[PDB]
Amino acid sequence: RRAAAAAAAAGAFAGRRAACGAVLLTELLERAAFYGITSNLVLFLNGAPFCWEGAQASEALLLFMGLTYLGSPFGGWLADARLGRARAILLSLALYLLGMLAFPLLAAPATRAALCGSARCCSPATFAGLVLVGLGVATVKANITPFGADQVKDRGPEATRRFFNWFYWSINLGAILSLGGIAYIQQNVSFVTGYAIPTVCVGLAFVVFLCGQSVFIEDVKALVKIVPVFLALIPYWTVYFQMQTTYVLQSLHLRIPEISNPHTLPAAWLTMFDAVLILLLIPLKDKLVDPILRRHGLLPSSLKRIAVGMFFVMCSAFAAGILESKRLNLVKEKTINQTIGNVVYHAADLSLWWQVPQYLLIGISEIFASIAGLEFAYSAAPKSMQSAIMGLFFFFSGVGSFVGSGLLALVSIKAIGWMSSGNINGCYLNYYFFLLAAIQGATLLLFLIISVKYD
Amino acid sequence: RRAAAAAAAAGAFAGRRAACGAVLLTELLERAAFYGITSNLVLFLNGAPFCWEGAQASEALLLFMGLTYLGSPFGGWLADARLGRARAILLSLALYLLGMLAFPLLAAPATRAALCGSARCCSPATFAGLVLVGLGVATVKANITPFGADQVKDRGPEATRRFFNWFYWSINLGAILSLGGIAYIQQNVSFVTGYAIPTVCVGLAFVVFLCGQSVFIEDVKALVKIVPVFLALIPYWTVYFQMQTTYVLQSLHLRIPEISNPHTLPAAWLTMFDAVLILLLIPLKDKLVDPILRRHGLLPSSLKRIAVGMFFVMCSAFAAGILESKRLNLVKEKTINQTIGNVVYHAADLSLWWQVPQYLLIGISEIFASIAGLEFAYSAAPKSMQSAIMGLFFFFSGVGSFVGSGLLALVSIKAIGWMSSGNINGCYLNYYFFLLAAIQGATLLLFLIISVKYD
Ligand SMILES: CCOc1ccc(-c2cc(C(=O)NCCCN3CCCC[C@H]3C)c3ccccc3n2)cc1
Ligand SMILES: CCOc1ccc(-c2cc(C(=O)NCCCN3CCCC[C@H]3C)c3ccccc3n2)cc1
Ligand SMILES: CC(C)CCC[C@@H](C)[C@H]1CC[C@H]2[C@@H]3CC=C4C[C@@H](O)CC[C@]4(C)[C@H]3CC[C@]12C
Ligand SMILES: CC(C)CCC[C@@H](C)[C@H]1CC[C@H]2[C@@H]3CC=C4C[C@@H](O)CC[C@]4(C)[C@H]3CC[C@]12C
Ligand SMILES: CC(C)CCC[C@@H](C)[C@H]1CC[C@H]2[C@@H]3CC=C4C[C@@H](O)CC[C@]4(C)[C@H]3CC[C@]12C
Ligand SMILES: CC(C)CCC[C@@H](C)[C@H]1CC[C@H]2[C@@H]3CC=C4C[C@@H](O)CC[C@]4(C)[C@H]3CC[C@]12C
Ligand SMILES: *[C@@H]1O[C@H](CO)[C@@H](O)[C@H](O)[C@H]1NC(C)=O
Ligand SMILES: *[C@@H]1O[C@H](CO)[C@@H](O)[C@H](O)[C@H]1NC(C)=O
């Protein structure tokens, strides 16, 4: 029947292995270079060559992250009006290499005096490197997501679903290689070697495209029809980025095992726990949910898969507040010392691996909501305005990130006092996970109404 | 359009006010007589005239409740094969009056010696009264639910939806008048007056029918298509009846305010808290969800409204375990004494009205799942086999009640120890609400697959 014709299209890519594989390898090397900057930027700026304060190093990363979301609609509109796609990603990866090159030069003591030898020490050389990398990320993310799906666009809307499974797989594989390997080198071996590795990862990502150019391939009503879907995701992004911040804070105050008898393991390894599960669950989805949910006709659309992923975000926030209520009860009796990075944390005597049911549930959530979110921004976009809708899709991702940071500033005031105090043992973090479960539950009920009124 | 034609049918009952109103008043007086027996049966049998043990009084109520679920398919098949509907409810309410009459006779000291004057003291007079009342409830519930919807069956499947709103409203109104008024009289005034009131409520329910007779009005494939829906509700009934038991246990160990300066308020008032909210939320649904969800085309089917009600059961179980973790933390510091019934309870100094967010969520759940559950058992039944499907619908309601009681026996063993100990301050009741949230969440995901594969 029609289910057999869709399962026949599941045998996809069919000759376009080098066309799609050049896109997967480019984004694998671009995510490997993004977490080369983001993981140890504050440790680098608040260090021995640069004597910046802790607030000035954190506000430099906050303006860097916000520039990767603010520049996405402009980096995608420029790929529609003036340039193409492939000329816009080659232009951006050239600028993403130029700003990236300043970080091995500032790390080296020989080349540091050439840039800024004669409050902030080297602010013209540092902030100029953050602008070119930040505008490089925003233009790539807006443009590499439709362009990779344009190769398998010919084989229906089901082959593009299988592309975003392995596109989101190589994003997480590039994050494991950067947060695991490169972030270990930047803290314990050298910043000179540790920033030269992601700069080579940009240059290889530029070469894979020039080697890969040989194999590559009513609307006003369509704009106002999809803006209420993106506005309904702003409370979803709020819960999403505040789990990434606060599950790491729960991991720091929990008993982390030691690995050897270069010491003092990085704090970027605690952000890997989400992405390790995604490497295990995408081959599980691609081989047991592309078959199984298709020949039973179950859950075919992209907007209903976002609502499934919203269900496992809420179940993760409950499982986090249950563990945090147990941990705050257990930290009153005894408290052990552990050092993560270069600061000691007062951890309870409860194992780190009790945080695994939190990461299964946001793991399963990104299996559904994150891959189908890329499918909706691609399919529900006009042909002239693709990658400018991807630009707005990651702009409202950043709007939810800053209103989530303002939510943490709201529960930190003296009137509420949930986050009044690097120690959270006097904070009520479990009450904040229960608030995120209530915001996510109201977001789920709101999104189901928007999803039906969209169709 | 078609939404205006459905809103025109929302102006329903249209001349059949006395036909439906005789059915609403009969079930109001039948629920008032059911909780006249159930609320203080154990206190009556374990009392001054009858010297039964606490186990023998509880097993008499457990065989009584199980007989109201076991006899429902047989009391409804008898209303299809041999008798009609109205001749089956008049026959059952005659037997529901005959067994009910033994309870004022055993309560009175003059007429007690005539029945059983010369282990268990008066077991032939007591168990014979429980059989006729128990078979009377099972035959009425199987038959009064299709028969009331047969009056407004002519005006489409939307007028029957408005019947089960006010049919389920008068069930809860009959429960407030019995658990509030009659259960107060049975414990503090007299059992003679206190059981004579629900016996008059049966006799008035028999007279309203004889006064109301003047105004009243492929299938083998249809059986096996709806059995997997009833089997998928067995984990829903498991969580449903175990919340009714364990929210009362949480209310007993929580600070209940006093009302006067007849003392010692009944324990049946703590079961009223669910039904008081239902009296406030059914006029809210009938006047703001029959309009609003209809002209927006939102959530039209009965099986998707059961899945909405399954979502608020799970959110109630989380809100219950969060309050119970706070209460067990607070009971370690200080503990007050309060007497409910005739036994003292060691309550924490936390107010009873913090249990209100638990009862809003199961309140909203019965607004969706309980009314739409009656609609599915009526609409998805063959015309020859109606009220035998209602009989199976309340039989699987009872299967979930006894497998829920076996779940409490499973978490009470020494290997798990969540319910190893009338005191729950040494028990982990919060871990049992979190288990019920996990069973309900897996039931929701199971029911959505069954609901799609049904359609
Ligand atoms: C309902 C909305 O659905 C979503 C749709 C799209 C995306 C999404 C996300 C990213 C990303 O930035 N992924 C981060 C990696 C893993 N990451 C590593 C550190 C710790 C936390 C962990 C999540 C991303 C990147 C590059 C190009 C596209 C991208 N599209 C997410 C959700
Ligand atoms: C997804 C399944 O959906 C449901 C469908 C039907 C029913 C249901 C239920 C009853 C009942 O027995 N209601 C009890 C009253 C209130 N009750 C009073 C004490 C404390 C607890 C509180 C719930 C009932 C009675 C008489 C005729 C029909 C009836 N149909 C329930 C759920
Ligand atoms: C009782 C008070 C709180 C009103 C409750 C309204 C909430 C609880 C209910 C009522 C209307 C419901 C929505 C109506 C719209 C739809 C479309 C339906 O096809 C899928 C479910 C979905 C998304 C429902 C989600 C839950 C919902 C929002
Ligand atoms: C989708 C939403 C509605 C899910 C419900 C979660 C929220 C609203 C529920 C879950 C647990 C509930 C809490 C249960 C226990 C307590 C502790 C008590 O000291 C104050 C009330 C309070 C704080 C309740 C507030 C409301 C509450 C937090
Ligand atoms: C619908 C479902 C997902 C609701 C979630 C309930 C389950 C998955 C959550 C609720 C409470 C959570 C628990 C919170 C506390 C503990 C105690 C600790 O010693 C081991 C982890 C453990 C056991 C967590 C396991 C997962 C957990 C039981
Ligand atoms: C990743 C592992 C746990 C597999 C997860 C399967 C669960 C989480 C998902 C996968 C398939 C999904 C179901 C597929 C069938 C449907 C019909 C769809 O129209 C409504 C939702 C519903 C009812 C889905 C509920 C959630 C569901 C059961
Ligand atoms: C943990 O660190 C604190 C801070 O110096 C110290 O007072 C305490 O003795 C340490 N405890 C252990 C067990 O090392
Ligand atoms: C509560 O009851 C117990 C049981 O007799 C008793 O020991 C205790 O003193 C009582 N406390 C108060 C405050 O009455």
Coordinates of N, CA and C in Angstrom, one line a residue, chain A residues 184-310:
Chain A
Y184 N 39.8 18.6 27.5 CA 40.9 18.0 28.4 C 42.2 18.6 28.1
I185 N 42.5 18.9 26.9 CA 43.8 19.4 26.5 C 44.0 20.8 26.9
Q186 N 42.9 21.6 26.7 CA 42.9 23.0 27.0 C 43.2 23.3 28.5
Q187 N 42.8 22.5 29.4 CA 42.9 22.7 30.8 C 44.2 22.1 31.3
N188 N 44.5 20.9 30.9 CA 45.6 20.1 31.5 C 46.9 20.0 30.8
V189 N 46.8 20.1 29.4 CA 48.0 20.0 28.6 C 48.6 21.4 28.3
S190 N 47.8 22.2 27.5 CA 48.2 23.5 27.0 C 47.0 24.2 26.4
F191 N 47.0 25.5 26.5 CA 46.0 26.3 25.7 C 46.5 26.5 24.2
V192 N 47.8 26.4 24.0 CA 48.4 26.5 22.7 C 48.0 25.4 21.8
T193 N 48.3 24.1 22.3 CA 47.8 23.0 21.6 C 46.3 22.9 21.6
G194 N 45.7 23.3 22.8 CA 44.3 23.1 23.0 C 43.4 24.0 22.1
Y195 N 43.9 25.2 21.7 CA 43.2 26.0 20.7 C 43.6 25.8 19.3
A196 N 44.8 25.1 19.1 CA 45.2 24.9 17.7 C 44.4 23.7 17.1
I197 N 43.9 22.8 18.0 CA 43.1 21.7 17.5 C 41.7 22.1 16.9
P198 N 41.0 23.0 17.5 CA 39.7 23.4 16.9 C 39.9 24.4 15.7
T199 N 41.1 25.0 15.6 CA 41.3 25.9 14.4 C 41.6 25.0 13.2
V200 N 42.2 23.9 13.4 CA 42.4 22.9 12.3 C 41.0 22.3 12.0
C201 N 40.1 22.2 12.9 CA 38.8 21.6 12.7 C 38.0 22.6 11.8
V202 N 38.2 23.9 11.9 CA 37.6 24.8 11.0 C 38.1 24.7 9.6
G203 N 39.5 24.6 9.5 CA 40.1 24.6 8.2 C 39.8 23.3 7.4
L204 N 39.7 22.2 8.2 CA 39.3 20.9 7.5 C 37.8 21.0 7.1
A205 N 37.0 21.8 7.9 CA 35.6 21.9 7.5 C 35.4 22.8 6.3
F206 N 36.4 23.7 6.0 CA 36.4 24.5 4.8 C 36.9 23.7 3.6
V207 N 37.8 22.7 3.8 CA 38.3 21.9 2.7 C 37.4 20.9 2.2
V208 N 36.6 20.3 3.2 CA 35.6 19.3 2.8 C 34.5 19.8 1.9
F209 N 34.2 21.1 2.1 CA 33.3 21.8 1.1 C 33.9 22.0 -0.2
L210 N 35.1 22.5 -0.3 CA 35.7 22.7 -1.7 C 36.0 21.3 -2.3
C211 N 36.3 20.3 -1.5 CA 36.3 19.0 -2.1 C 34.9 18.4 -2.4
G212 N 33.9 19.0 -1.8 CA 32.5 18.5 -1.9 C 31.6 19.3 -2.8
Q213 N 32.1 20.3 -3.4 CA 31.3 21.1 -4.4 C 31.0 20.3 -5.6
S214 N 31.7 19.3 -5.9 CA 31.5 18.5 -7.1 C 30.3 17.5 -7.0
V215 N 29.9 17.3 -5.8 CA 28.8 16.3 -5.6 C 27.5 16.8 -5.1
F216 N 27.5 18.1 -4.7 CA 26.3 18.8 -4.2 C 25.3 19.0 -5.2
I217 N 24.1 19.4 -4.8 CA 23.0 19.6 -5.7 C 22.7 21.1 -5.8
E218 N 1.3 33.9 -1.5 CA 1.2 32.6 -0.8 C 2.2 32.5 0.3
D219 N 3.4 33.1 0.1 CA 4.5 33.0 1.1 C 4.3 34.0 2.2
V220 N 3.6 35.0 2.0 CA 3.2 36.0 3.1 C 2.2 35.3 4.0
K221 N 1.3 34.5 3.5 CA 0.5 33.7 4.3 C 1.3 32.6 5.1
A222 N 2.4 32.1 4.5 CA 3.1 31.1 5.1 C 4.0 31.6 6.2
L223 N 4.3 32.9 6.2 CA 5.1 33.5 7.3 C 4.3 33.6 8.6
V224 N 3.1 34.2 8.5 CA 2.3 34.4 9.6 C 1.6 33.2 10.1
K225 N 1.7 32.1 9.4 CA 1.1 30.8 9.8 C 2.1 30.0 10.7
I226 N 3.4 30.3 10.6 CA 4.4 29.6 11.4 C 5.1 30.4 12.4
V227 N 4.8 31.7 12.5 CA 5.3 32.5 13.6 C 4.6 32.1 15.0
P228 N 3.3 31.8 15.0 CA 2.8 31.4 16.3 C 3.3 30.0 16.8
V229 N 3.9 29.2 15.9 CA 4.5 28.0 16.3 C 5.9 28.3 16.9
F230 N 6.6 29.2 16.4 CA 7.9 29.6 16.9 C 7.8 30.3 18.3
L231 N 6.7 31.1 18.4 CA 6.4 31.8 19.7 C 6.0 30.8 20.8
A232 N 5.4 29.7 20.4 CA 5.0 28.7 21.3 C 6.1 27.9 21.8
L233 N 7.3 27.9 21.1 CA 8.5 27.2 21.5 C 9.3 28.0 22.5
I234 N 9.1 29.3 22.7 CA 9.9 30.1 23.6 C 9.8 29.6 25.1
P235 N 8.6 29.2 25.6 CA 8.7 28.5 26.9 C 9.3 27.1 26.8
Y236 N 9.4 26.5 25.7 CA 10.1 25.2 25.6 C 11.6 25.4 25.6
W237 N 12.1 26.5 25.0 CA 13.6 26.8 25.0 C 14.0 27.2 26.4
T238 N 13.1 27.9 27.1 CA 13.3 28.3 28.5 C 13.7 27.2 29.4
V239 N 12.9 26.1 29.3 CA 13.1 24.9 30.2 C 14.3 24.2 29.6
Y240 N 14.6 24.2 28.3 CA 15.6 23.4 27.7 C 17.0 23.9 28.1
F241 N 17.2 25.2 28.1 CA 18.6 25.7 28.4 C 18.8 25.8 29.9
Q242 N 17.7 25.9 30.7 CA 17.9 25.9 32.1 C 18.1 24.5 32.7
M243 N 17.8 23.5 31.9 CA 18.2 22.2 32.4 C 19.7 21.9 32.1
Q244 N 20.2 22.5 31.0 CA 21.6 22.3 30.7 C 22.5 23.0 31.8
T245 N 22.1 24.1 32.3 CA 22.8 24.8 33.3 C 22.7 24.1 34.7
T246 N 21.5 23.7 35.0 CA 21.2 23.2 36.4 C 21.4 21.7 36.6
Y247 N 21.5 20.9 35.5 CA 21.8 19.5 35.7 C 23.3 19.4 36.0
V248 N 24.1 20.4 35.4 CA 25.6 20.4 35.7 C 25.8 20.8 37.1
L249 N 25.0 21.8 37.6 CA 25.2 22.2 39.0 C 24.8 21.1 40.0
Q250 N 23.8 20.2 39.6 CA 23.5 19.0 40.4 C 24.6 18.0 40.3
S251 N 25.3 17.9 39.2 CA 26.4 16.9 39.0 C 27.6 17.3 39.8
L252 N 27.9 18.6 39.9 CA 29.0 19.1 40.7 C 28.9 18.8 42.1
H253 N 27.6 18.9 42.7 CA 27.4 18.6 44.1 C 26.9 17.2 44.3
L254 N 27.4 16.3 43.5 CA 27.1 14.9 43.6 C 28.4 14.1 43.4
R255 N 28.5 12.9 44.0 CA 29.8 12.2 44.1 C 30.2 11.7 42.7
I256 N 31.2 12.3 42.2 CA 31.8 12.0 40.9 C 33.0 11.1 41.1
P257 N 33.1 9.9 40.4 CA 34.3 9.0 40.6 C 35.5 9.6 39.9
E258 N 36.7 9.1 40.5 CA 37.9 9.5 39.9 C 38.4 8.4 38.9
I259 N 39.2 8.8 37.9 CA 39.6 8.0 36.8 C 41.0 7.5 36.9
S260 N 41.9 8.3 37.4 CA 43.3 7.8 37.5 C 43.8 8.0 39.0
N261 N 45.1 7.5 39.2 CA 45.7 7.6 40.5 C 46.4 8.9 40.7
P262 N 48.8 15.5 34.7 CA 47.5 16.0 34.4 C 46.4 15.5 35.3
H263 N 46.0 16.3 36.2 CA 44.9 16.0 37.2 C 43.7 16.9 36.9
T264 N 42.7 16.8 37.9 CA 41.6 17.7 38.0 C 40.8 17.9 36.7
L265 N 40.0 16.8 36.4 CA 39.1 16.6 35.3 C 38.3 17.8 35.0
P266 N 38.0 18.0 33.7 CA 37.3 19.2 33.3 C 35.8 19.2 33.7
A267 N 35.3 20.4 33.8 CA 33.8 20.6 34.1 C 33.0 20.4 32.8
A268 N 33.7 20.3 31.6 CA 33.0 20.1 30.4 C 32.6 18.7 30.2
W269 N 33.2 17.8 30.9 CA 32.8 16.4 30.8 C 31.4 16.1 31.4
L270 N 30.9 17.0 32.3 CA 29.6 16.9 32.9 C 28.5 17.4 31.9
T271 N 28.9 18.1 30.9 CA 27.9 18.5 29.8 C 27.8 17.4 28.8
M272 N 28.7 16.4 28.8 CA 28.7 15.4 27.8 C 27.6 14.3 28.0
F273 N 27.0 14.3 29.2 CA 26.1 13.2 29.6 C 24.8 13.1 28.8
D274 N 24.4 14.3 28.3 CA 23.3 14.3 27.4 C 23.7 13.8 26.1
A275 N 24.8 14.2 25.6 CA 25.2 13.9 24.2 C 25.7 12.4 24.0
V276 N 26.1 11.8 25.1 CA 26.5 10.4 24.9 C 25.3 9.5 24.7
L277 N 24.1 9.9 25.3 CA 22.9 9.1 25.2 C 22.3 9.3 23.8
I278 N 22.6 10.5 23.2 CA 22.0 10.8 21.8 C 22.7 9.9 20.8
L279 N 24.0 9.6 21.0 CA 24.7 8.8 20.1 C 24.2 7.3 20.1
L280 N 23.6 7.0 21.3 CA 23.1 5.6 21.4 C 21.6 5.5 21.0
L281 N 20.9 6.6 20.9 CA 19.4 6.5 20.7 C 19.0 6.9 19.3
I282 N 19.8 7.7 18.6 CA 19.6 7.9 17.2 C 19.7 6.7 16.3
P283 N 20.7 5.8 16.4 CA 20.6 4.5 15.7 C 19.5 3.6 16.2
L284 N 19.0 3.8 17.4 CA 17.9 3.1 17.9 C 16.6 3.6 17.2
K285 N 16.5 5.0 17.0 CA 15.3 5.5 16.3 C 15.3 5.2 14.8
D286 N 16.5 5.3 14.2 CA 16.6 5.2 12.8 C 16.4 3.7 12.3
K287 N 16.6 2.8 13.2 CA 16.4 1.4 12.9 C 15.3 0.7 13.6
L288 N 14.7 1.4 14.6 CA 13.5 0.8 15.2 C 12.3 1.7 15.4
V289 N 12.4 3.0 14.9 CA 11.2 3.8 14.9 C 10.9 4.3 13.5
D290 N 11.8 4.5 12.6 CA 11.5 4.5 11.2 C 10.8 3.3 10.7
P291 N 11.2 2.0 11.0 CA 10.4 0.9 10.7 C 9.0 0.9 11.4
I292 N 9.1 0.9 12.8 CA 7.9 0.4 13.6 C 6.8 1.4 13.6
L293 N 7.1 2.7 13.8 CA 6.0 3.7 13.8 C 5.5 4.0 12.4
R294 N 6.1 3.5 11.3 CA 5.6 3.8 10.0 C 4.6 2.8 9.5
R295 N 4.8 1.5 9.7 CA 3.9 0.5 9.2 C 2.7 0.3 10.1
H296 N 2.7 1.0 11.3 CA 1.5 1.0 12.1 C 0.8 2.4 12.0
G297 N 1.4 3.3 11.2 CA 0.7 4.6 11.0 C 0.7 5.5 12.2
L298 N 1.6 5.3 13.1 CA 1.6 6.0 14.4 C 2.6 7.2 14.3
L299 N 2.0 8.3 14.7 CA 2.7 9.6 14.9 C 3.5 10.1 13.7
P300 N 2.8 10.5 12.6 CA 3.5 10.7 11.3 C 4.0 12.2 11.2
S301 N 3.4 13.1 11.9 CA 3.8 14.5 11.6 C 4.9 15.0 12.6
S302 N 5.5 16.1 12.2 CA 6.6 16.7 12.9 C 6.1 17.4 14.2
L303 N 5.0 18.1 14.1 CA 4.5 18.8 15.3 C 4.0 18.0 16.4
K304 N 3.5 16.8 16.1 CA 3.1 15.8 17.2 C 4.3 15.2 17.8
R305 N 5.5 15.1 17.1 CA 6.7 14.6 17.7 C 7.4 15.6 18.6
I306 N 7.1 16.9 18.4 CA 7.6 17.9 19.3 C 6.8 17.8 20.6
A307 N 5.5 17.5 20.5 CA 4.7 17.4 21.7 C 5.1 16.1 22.5
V308 N 5.5 15.1 21.8 CA 6.0 13.9 22.5 C 7.3 14.2 23.2
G309 N 8.2 15.0 22.6 CA 9.4 15.4 23.2 C 9.2 16.4 24.4
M310 N 8.1 17.2 24.3 CA 7.8 18.0 25.4 C 7.3 17.2 26.6

